[PDB]
Amino acid sequence: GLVPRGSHMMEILRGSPALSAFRINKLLARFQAANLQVHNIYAEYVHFADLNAPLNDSEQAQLTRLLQYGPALSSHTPAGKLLLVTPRPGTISPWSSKATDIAHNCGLQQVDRLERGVAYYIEASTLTAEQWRQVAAELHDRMMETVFSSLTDAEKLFIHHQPAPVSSVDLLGEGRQALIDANLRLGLALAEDEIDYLQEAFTKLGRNPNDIELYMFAQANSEHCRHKIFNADWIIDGKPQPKSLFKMIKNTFETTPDYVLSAYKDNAAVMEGSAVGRYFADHNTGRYDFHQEPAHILMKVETHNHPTAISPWPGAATGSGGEIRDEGATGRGAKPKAGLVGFSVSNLRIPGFEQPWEEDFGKPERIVTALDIMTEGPLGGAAFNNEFGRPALTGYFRTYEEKVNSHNGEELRGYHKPIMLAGGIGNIRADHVQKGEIVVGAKLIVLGGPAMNIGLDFASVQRDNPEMERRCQEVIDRCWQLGDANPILFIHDVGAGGLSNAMPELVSDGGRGGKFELRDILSDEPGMSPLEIWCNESQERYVLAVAADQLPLFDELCKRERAPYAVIGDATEEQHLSLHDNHFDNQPIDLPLDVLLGKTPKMTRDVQTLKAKGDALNRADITIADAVKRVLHLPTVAEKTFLVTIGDRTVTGMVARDQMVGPWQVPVADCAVTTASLDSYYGEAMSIGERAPVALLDFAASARLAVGEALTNIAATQIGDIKRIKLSANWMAAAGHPGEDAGLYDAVKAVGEELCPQLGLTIPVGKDSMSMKTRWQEGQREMTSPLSLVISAFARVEDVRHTLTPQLSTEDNALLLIDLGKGHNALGATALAQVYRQLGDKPADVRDVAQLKGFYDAMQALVAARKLLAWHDRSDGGLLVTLAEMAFAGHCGVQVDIAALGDDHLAALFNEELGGVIQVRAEDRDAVEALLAQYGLADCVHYLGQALAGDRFVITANDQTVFSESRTTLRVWWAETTWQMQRLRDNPQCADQEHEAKANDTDPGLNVKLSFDINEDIAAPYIATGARPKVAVLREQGVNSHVEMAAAFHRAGFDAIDVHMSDLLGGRIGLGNFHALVACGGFSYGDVLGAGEGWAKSILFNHRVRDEFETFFHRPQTLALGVCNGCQMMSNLRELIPGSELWPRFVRNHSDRFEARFSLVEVTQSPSLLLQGMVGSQMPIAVSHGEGRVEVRDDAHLAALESKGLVALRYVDNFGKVTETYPANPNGSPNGITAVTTENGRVTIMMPHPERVFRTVANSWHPENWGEDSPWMRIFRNARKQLG
Ligand SMILES: Nc1ncnc2c1ncn2[C@@H]1O[C@H](COP(=O)(O)OP(=O)(O)O)[C@@H](O)[C@H]1O
Ligand SMILES: [Mg+2]
Ligand SMILES: [Mg+2]
């Protein structure tokens, strides 16, 4: 199709079927349930190409080919009613941004913009007008899409509007009322004294303020940006208080400044790391090399609570996206490493899986449900982390919604407005920690995405394009990788308020002013007013300052990465802010910074204390047996697989300890651990402590417990000095709600002025979200969150190899409980209470500070001395859950006695006091108990019993059996929540298969079989000569796992060279100079138009580069490796590779979900030179992909491929048999195929990541006797030897 579209032409290209069978049956079932007589539904992707010039026959064929991708699903002739779903007019999908990028990189400049929709064909010849609109409703997201009746209506998506002029607010001609009107019209939310400020400011200037100036001011002065509460003076119960909340947090730094390099003066904090080999490509040579130097650690944690309540996916995605920008913009440039995620929502009320404690209290129509948030939110956060390229290694997920008698009496307390938390750590160079000085005349730049009207219901719908941020990170990396020559003088993230906040922030921080040109800013929507361009909160943008003479270098760096950037201003000596508009020949902004950034009076909060009395727990319906079952069914306690495997946990190749633990990969790791470099055992650790419900009874206790839990979760890691542990404190509260204000102050004081200073813990970073409540009319109703402090702990690790997990051993052992509760056994605000719809009387709390410090120190002593077999702290679910989860991870039984824990067995098993259980060798029990005694924990330590081979979970009290059950049964109950979530979000068959496998106790877990000596470095003789063959580490825009690949080849004796597609196109690199090449993993073009397709087709359509690749593959002795995205790319290049005619395609996983797994595979017989000597071996490997499913044209193709003997790797279950059952086989590949080679064996492509686990320490689970090298190191060594 091709028709006029304004000054352009719009082509309509038919796409492939968009919905698989189960997705269609889910739609049909959804229709039936709603009384909509739908007989059948079919869907097809439809593409729209807005062209600024004609395409010749060749160009047309190329575009049509670019738009041919995805699973080869059953195609049908359209029938029924057409309902086209597309992005809403005035919006541009991220798909469009990346798809259009691909077209341009294939030399199709005529393509102004590509967009995609979904054509639904509905057969239901008996529906009415309202019914059809209800059908329409079920087929699209009302907050992001719209429905059209004709394909031609897509033209509305490309309308170009003329630029809207600035608008002045008539203060001089109307008086104060002009500002009052504007405050309402523009939704400025200005306070009365802020209007007063503005009125005087502009009356003094003698001119009307432009809407843009008022908007910029409003955003910078919102509670979100100014933090008025955290800086206000306080009067509590009549007594003025000396410190503000922020000053009390800073008190922790004043008391403990140890190891802190940067705090409260950047978008993240920085603490000392370790001197290790920072690995990266040299600017001059392009070769990857180790640079022995300090790799310091940055940390930051943020939230996106409001956005997520409106549009979960984007809300969570940009929650991570924004925090990642904070990290990279630290100092003069830094690199994100790992991340963490947090969620707090109300009851899920899963259809058909309702729990006894859940009650529908209703909710506002304008927000989404808790279930929707936990369905779309995690996928959005994972989408950004996966596509950008940072592993998500730790987090929390709590559900809470109950009518309780708290501080303000009987009310509904919960999370209709959720907590969406995203944070992480990164590494930074010593010389880049401090911001540089901004020289007068410095060029002011916007690095990143174009401006769109996203900042401002619909105003809270965000947009994420992780690939754009990835391109930006590559630039930042080039900059800091230049060390002393780093062009970045100052960098800052673009967040709330958009450029209107970020740019003034930047020049102000540097003590300068700035003059800007509105028309220099990159924009993708011409109709925007100056206010919209300047104030929108579009994503993936950074602002920085570079010296004029460094512009050429900076330009070089951006062009090579294809990272958009624009110089939009100049720093000035005069501290004034000017924004000119060349199009309207005027000045939207003309203000002195002292006026714009001037502050209205400081806030004073005069409040009083409200303290709930608490009520004894009613045990009428409670029994220990029923409590176990209920508690294991509380999402907060239950298995979190649905939140873990959806996120990459291996990218960077520096992940030592991820959430999944042991042979059975059970997600119960208490903290995350990464190595500091690809050549060290030093590292970093992240943990989270949180206990919001307790705040409904005791504010201070809830805060102390959050700190305490972060500590107990990280305790079994080798850190040493407790002062190495640094905290991020994120405070969520419903400020203004009765009692919450005084509670917040008491809570901050409890940790900032008392607990942390005494323990020696610094809180160098943090944030606050102060409107955690939701109101609406149910026929007024209110859902108010408990004060919610989330503590994230970060620390330098001394030896990542000594970390302990909950995986119990069955060798002669002793289980010892460390009860920091000192026998209090509090049950108030516990999972137990919650599961019985109660809050209880008294909650847990830090009972003895000295003993908590002693606990930590003792654990550190035990960890360093290698005296522990396992560790698991107590938190949600109490001792019962701790022991249960340990049995789950150890796939064994437990025989414990609790007679010494009090006569109240319910309280003993379910209290959530601090502490945990350590497992030690039986012969070390006395020595360990003696060590603990030396730290003053004698009467807190209790011998419980031992772990035993088997399936029995037994708890006794003298001759009495308190509770006894099949560990497997408990394990399955504990898994029902993730099972149900996976069943409603992914392919039901897959969800069922994974859940059901958990019920088979005979599962031996991951296990190895080796056909060769893993420690024999067959490449050593070659490396010893000093001759190092080069290997082209190929990458394209969006690709995120190249450093780790280079490191693997590097250890094998190769000189790894960074080869960007831009280098090949530019003639800077030629494949004729290489004998080996490797296509890397990552998300080239964000997998848009099919994973690996844009990369491959950009090569195919650029004949010069195409010829280069073909030539390489046709040489007699060249070797090529394609991993993950590289595997997909090469599979789409078959026409250039000899002996590849039988290769399959790689498409969307059968589960229809991204799979981050540690999968078991077997090396099969094939000509592959890279798998030489490894045939018959069985070992786990890193898997991280959403489109790794081998797809053939027909069985004839599959049979031919098999008979030719080209299959090199197959997924096998733990029993060792080839399998297609999920998740043993994570993507559903036929015959378990996941790697194939060519007839001559010189080229091999595989979906798993061998390079991510070549270091034994980077294997989630591995045999205890392994050395530094895992079996996968042999692939790289084989490559080296093969070249000779
Ligand atoms: N939202 C989440 N995203 C990623 N991982 C999570 C999330 N929530 C929990 N996890 C992980 O699941 C495992 C168990 O979670 P949880 O029981 O809440 O931890 P704990 O009680 O030890 O503090 C941990 O390894 C944790 O890091
Ligand atoms: Mg838990
Ligand atoms: Mg824990």
Ligand SMILES: [Mg+2]
């Ligand atoms: Mg926790």
